[PDB]
From a paper:
The histone H2A variant H2A.W occupies transposons and thus prevents access to them in Arabidopsis thaliana. H2A.W is deposited by the chromatin remodeler DDM1, which also promotes the accessibility of chromatin writers to heterochromatin by an unknown mechanism. Chromatin remodeling factors are proteins harboring an ATPase domain, and promote the translocation of nucleosomal DNA by distorting histone-DNA interactions. We now report the cryo-electron microscopy (cryo-EM) structures of nucleosomes containing H2A and H2A.W, and the DDM1-H2A.W nucleosome complex.
A single-particle cryo-EM workflow was performed on the H2A- and H2A.W-nucleosomes, and both structures of nucleosomes containing H2A and H2A.W were determined at 2.9 Å resolution. Interestingly, in the H2A nucleosome, the entry/exit regions of nucleosomal DNA are disordered and only 113 base pairs (bps) of DNA are bound to the histone octamer. In the H2A nucleosome, we also found ambiguous cryo-EM density maps of the H2A C-terminal docking domain and the H3 αN helix. The histone-DNA contacts at the entry/exit regions of the nucleosomal DNA by the H3 αN helix are known to be supported by interactions with the H2A C-terminal docking domain. The nucleosome containing H2A forms an open structure, caused by the loss of the interactions with the H3 αN and α2 helices. Notably, the sliding activity was detected in both H2A and H2A.W nucleosomes.
Author numbering:
A (entry chain B): 20 to 102
B (entry chain H), G (entry chain D): 58 to 149
C (entry chain A): 61 to 134
D (entry chain G): 15 to 106
E (entry chain E): 60 to 135
F (entry chain F): 25 to 102
H (entry chain C): 16 to 106
The structure:
DNA sequence: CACGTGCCTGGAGACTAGGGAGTAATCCCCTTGGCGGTTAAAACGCGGGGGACAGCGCGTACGTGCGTTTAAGCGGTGCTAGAGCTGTCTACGACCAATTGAGCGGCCTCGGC
DNA sequence: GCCGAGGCCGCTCAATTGGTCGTAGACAGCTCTAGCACCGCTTAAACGCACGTACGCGCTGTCCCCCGCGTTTTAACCGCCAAGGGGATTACTCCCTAGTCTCCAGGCACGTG
């Protein structure tokens, strides 16, 4: 069950709504691929740290505290998912 | 079963704003914020105790941690409140 | 803003390259989605500042590149 | 049988904070003025955050703080944003 | 070093006067502060140059520095 | 004493960074930025001096102050 | 009096570049670099034992600290070298 | 014999062991932790020294000076992110 | 979501017993201050040409609407992997006393920049 | 050619090796929660296409305002001396906090208008 081409699940309207919430009025057609790349890098960093925390505790499930600690390493404190 | 600062946060709210309440999720967020600040101050105080080879953590270590982790006016007001509390505790 | 299920699939795909046969909690995926949306909104705010700087209104990939350069992200 | 929180004039638990500082292995010894100084700094910080959140809620003609109102307290005051950095609140 | 030592030392003392009266400074402290300050200003000017190039310019104005600082996060 | 950071010093710092031409209003903004940076670092350093019951600011205090800001400095007693 | 990494760094230098020498200030910088990395990997190994109620710093904690501090390929090579060293030490 | 010869390392296992004991990092230190810092604090020194020597060769020198270390830190993508914004004295 | 009532686990009072922090005395380094000479760098004025900024016209590419197609959200069922907790035992690390050589300060000597 | 990198030498404060002791961690078992897989129907969101006009971008011109240069001013910098605060170390006496047991009420869950 190989997974591939799932980066296109971040559809054009999703990126466009995110930009609208950020104040962007006009979006060029080349922003979308760049947004996919940036999101992929961010997710790679966070997931790498979270998997490190998961494998420290001898687990096969990534939990909310792992992601919270991974984000906290990045200076992106997250509240409401435990602590 | 789990220790939380719900009663004390509720009391502080009832003092600052007598006509506003808190939702359960807001209490959870406030508890998380309090725990985060407590951990940030405790870890810094431990680091200062360790660097200077001090076995004990005193009020001066906590004062320095407060002045190092909080921004300016918050640090000044927090130092004033803490000194007031420590003086009132020692005297009485 | 992002559909839940495509984001879940993307997160699992990325996690596959780091540790195989991995399982997730729903709270973990929700936390990742919240953090990712916040990060993208902040990036778009800085991108809009960069676009305003250059006297235009349409944001372009060079704006993202400059914002991430100044931010220190690689 | 007066509590250490009553001797100082606080609502946060001095004894609980001391026990947290003793079982967290921050230092092998903890003084008598460190539990009374954090329990005041934390109370002041909770009061500040609750005051700003209540102001945000009152401006929105509501009388019960909800997680969105905390995200407007911390994202209007520069000091809180510098103290917490990039802070994301759930259901906000 | 690109900044003369005596003016920087006087500036550091003048700034420190507002945090505690009657301070003494070691020579090593002023040297470290000067090195850090020069490095910080050079990095800021690099970012300002990127901002100026973005706007199709070769002359940097204060708006470039403001944008660089704002994206960095120092000014808010 | 902020005027001691003169126009050619700022110009040399800018040239070190690759700037080709400098406007006339850059100098005041640069002085303000430098003041803010020094204020933060010196505040942290003075806090560290207070912790040690001292009346002198040492190199280690400045090194620690810059470490709090992600400005690791080497060669001054590390 | 003051213990320093001076002989060790020279020994490592005369393994990769046997013909290049090194100055005293470069000793200062490398010693500072080793100290910074050591306290990083020790602080993040103590915070992985405290937040687990574990009184021991095993090799597993050091590996997790290595994977959390160092960048990707650098971390992979470091964990490889550390595992090789621990295997050799346990075997002999 | 020594604890560094068992691991085949050029760095002091015992000195790191006491630095990780007397620093009050944890109550108990394992037997394999000092032989894991020493093996990680030697790969990093090896990498930095290799890059510094490469920089020294590029400048037609036989010695590593602070300037060479700063160049090695700045050119390497990974070492720059590990140390952040590092200013090296006399660089 | 406030408000009332029973319970049980943790905070408080009193006491004694070591050891860490306060506090006084001393030594001698490093900081601060003043002064005179030289001289490198900063300041001032000026002539000019490079570039910043406004205006204008073109044609590219975006946004909005509309009809169609995709697959996401939901609600049930089913099953099993593995998270969380408890109990028991063997192995590993702290401590302490004897042994012995690696590493730090000082020197003399000698070749890269 | 000569001053900062290299090798040699004596000397104390570690690192090791060896035993013993108590307890922390590895490991085996078991109970129930929750994460994954599947299916079917609904329908909201994504998608593709068409059309118009908003605006990115290249070109042109004009004024202004940085830059390089020559001259005069000024204050940084080096060298020297004095004098004295206070950083660094050590020796002592005493007050603070850890560990224990008795005493009891604050604070967690759970049922309520």
């Amino acid at each position: 069950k190989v997974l591939r081409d799932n980066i296109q699940g971040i559809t054009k309207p999703a990126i466009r709504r995110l930009a609208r919430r950020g104040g962007v009025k006009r979006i060029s057609g080349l922003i979308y691929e760049e947004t996919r790349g940036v999101l992929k890098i961010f997710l790679e960093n966070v997931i790498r740290d979270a998997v490190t925390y998961t494998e420290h505790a001898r687990r096969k499930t990534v939990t909310a505290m792992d992601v919270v600690y991974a984000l906290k390493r990045q200076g992106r404190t997250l509240y409401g998912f435990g602590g | 079963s789990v220790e939380t600062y719900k009663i004390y946060i509720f009391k502080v709210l009832k003092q600052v704003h007598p006509d506003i309440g808190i939702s359960s999720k807001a209490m959870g967020i406030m508890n998380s914020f309090i725990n985060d600040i407590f951990e940030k101050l405790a870890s810094e105080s431990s680091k200062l105790a360790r660097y200077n080879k001090k076995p004990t953590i005193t009020s001066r270590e906590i004062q320095t941690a407060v002045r190092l982790v909080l921004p300016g006016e918050l640090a000044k007001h927090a130092v004033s409140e803490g000194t007031k509390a420590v003086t009132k505790f020692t005297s009485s | 803003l992002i559909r839940k299920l495509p984001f879940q699939r993307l997160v699992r795909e990325i996690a596959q390259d780091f540790k195989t046969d991995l399982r997730f909690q729903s709270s973990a995926v929700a936390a990742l989605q919240e953090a990712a949306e916040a990060y993208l909104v902040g990036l778009f705010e800085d991108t809009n500042l960069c676009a305003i700087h250059a006297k235009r209104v349409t944001i372009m990939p060079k704006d993202i590149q400059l914002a991430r350069r100044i931010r220190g992200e690689r | 049988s007066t509590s250490r929180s009553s001797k100082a004039g606080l609502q946060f638990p001095v004894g609980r904070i001391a026990r947290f500082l003793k079982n967290g292995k921050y230092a092998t010894r903890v003084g008598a003025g460190a539990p009374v100084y954090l329990a005041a700094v934390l109370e002041y910080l909770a009061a500040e955050v609750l005051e700003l959140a209540g102001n945000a809620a009152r401006d929105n003609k509501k009388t019960r703080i909800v997680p969105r109102h905390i995200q407007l307290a911390v994202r209007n005051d520069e000091e809180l944003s510098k103290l917490l950095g990039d802070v994301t609140i759930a259901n906000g």
